[PDB]
Amino acid sequence: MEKEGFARLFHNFDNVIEPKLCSTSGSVPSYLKGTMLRNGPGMFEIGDTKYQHWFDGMGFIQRYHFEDGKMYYSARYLESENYKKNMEAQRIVTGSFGTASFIHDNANVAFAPVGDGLYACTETPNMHRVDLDSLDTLEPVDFSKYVALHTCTAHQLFDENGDVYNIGSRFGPDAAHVFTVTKNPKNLQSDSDRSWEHTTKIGEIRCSETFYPTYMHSFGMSENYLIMFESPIRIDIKKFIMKRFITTTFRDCMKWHADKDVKIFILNKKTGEQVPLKLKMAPFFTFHHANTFERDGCLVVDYCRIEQAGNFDALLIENMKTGNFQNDALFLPYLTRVIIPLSIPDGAQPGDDLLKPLGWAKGCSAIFQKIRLKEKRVCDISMEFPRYHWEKINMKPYNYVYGSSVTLPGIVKADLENGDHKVWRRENDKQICGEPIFVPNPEGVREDDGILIVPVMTISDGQRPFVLILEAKNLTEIARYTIPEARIPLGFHAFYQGR
Ligand SMILES: [Fe+3]
């Protein structure tokens, strides 16, 4: 293992079974009491075989437990069927996003709450419940038992009732994006308070090109609508169905179709009917939607926009190892807003900007041609892993998005109202900020009355990783928990459970 560099983070991680008391500085308010689980890849080589892509590594879940003003750290591999088969063979024997083999249930991306249960997910129907304390891998769940689909996002969205929504893709001559709702099992007669049994298909929207469905990482949800982009990154289905004959991967069947505009698909959550508009915009890709809401007959969709991503060559392990392959400015994400009229007024003329009357929409336009949408950048400081104050303004007009940078910007708070953005600056270039999680003050009234939990990775053996606690109004540090391990993973998403 190197003393310095991103290569440090691609050596295999070891389990940390007994929760380790971390070193405290500062102090936290009484309402920081709960457990954050963080998902991501931890194992990048097995025996004589190595994974190719960042997204491939075996899921390695960390637990950051907050109690009595202290933090405790532990971490364990998800014991998926893939993990267990690979560990027994001592080689990479099951496929992954970007590596061919030498059931896809390596749920290394994020977590979905259903009732009182927490389910580790990847972009397949095959999930596992995980215990928030012991990090045991519990029962498997096959989401496709309830709705026929081949892939689905690991970014399920939920509402105040705890109902969980997702979009998946069903391949075939019929190819379609299927929109789903899973009713909270606590509010109905169910097998258990964590059962996925109340899952139905709301509706579906056919892919424009049956043999080139879009790749999709996330989507937006408002009070009445689910919205997705048909991105230029397309899965070559004919190539993919042959994968076991030509030794290829899912990622290698994806390409960015450079001559295609983006289409917007919108489904009414409650009617199940597609919004009957043809909506186009200039090409882009987004990993992560932020919040989504309705205002003045329009759907407002915020997201971190990437100009050009190919099929994610930039996130191959070899490319990230060097770190230097971060001078890819077309891959830098920016928080962006598009505003979509949900209807066209009688008498609209070609060239009319349907958003011109709406002063709050200035900077976006929606030109009647079909409607061509023009988005606007809402934060000039590049950011990714967006999060917001879900409890107060999910599906509602809102002011703030928190994200991570990827001089020395670390965490960014975008101000959608006035543009008074805030930044917590990293202390040196051996630090990397992870996804910030907003925890609300129970007695707060403003949208940013709360704190942020920020895991900070390091790429140097002279600096231990830590969890940073920021107050959310001005992003100043109020506490820091330094972890007695050499590394935490270059990970993906976290889930915080107050308790
Ligand atoms: Fe993600």
Author numbering: 1 to 102, 123 to 389, 393 to 429, 437 to 529
Question: What sentences appear in the manuscript?
Answer:
The nematode Caenorhabditis elegans has two genes that are annotated as β-carotene 15,15′-monooxygenase (BCMO) and are 17 centimorgan apart on chromosome II, but the function of BCMO-1 and BCMO-2 remains uncharacterized. Sequence homology indicates that the two enzymes belong to the carotenoid cleavage dioxygenase family that share a seven-bladed β-propeller fold with a nonheme iron center. Here we determined crystal structures of BCMO-1 and BCMO-2 at resolutions of 1.8 and 1.9 Å, respectively. Structural analysis reveals that BCMO-1 and BCMO-2 are strikingly similar to each other.
The full-length BCMO-2 was produced in same way as for BCMO-1, and was crystallized and diffracted to 1.9 Å. BCMO-2 has one molecule in an asymmetric unit and comprises 39 β-stands, 5 α-helices and 9 310-helices. Compared with BCMO-1, two 310-helices (η3 and η4 in the loop connecting α1 and β9) are not observed due to missing density for residues Pro103–Gly122. Residues Asp390–Ser392 from the β27–β28 loop and residues Leu430–Glu436 from the β31–β32 loop are not observed either. The β31–β32 loop hosts Ser435, the only insertion in BCMO-2 (530 residues in total) relative to BCMO-1 (529 residues). The RMSD value between BCMO-2 and BCMO-1 (chain A) is 0.39 Å for 429 Cα atoms aligned, indicating that these two structures are highly similar. The substrate tunnel of BCMO-2 passes through the helical dome. Its two ends are flanked by two unobserved fragments, Pro103–Gly122 and Leu430–Glu436, respectively. The second missing fragment hosts Leu430, the counterpart of BCMO-1 Phe430, and its lack of electron density allows the tunnel runs towards η9 and η10. The ligand bound to BCMO-2 was modeled as an imidazole, and the configuration of the BCMO-2 iron center was highly similar to that of BCMO-1.
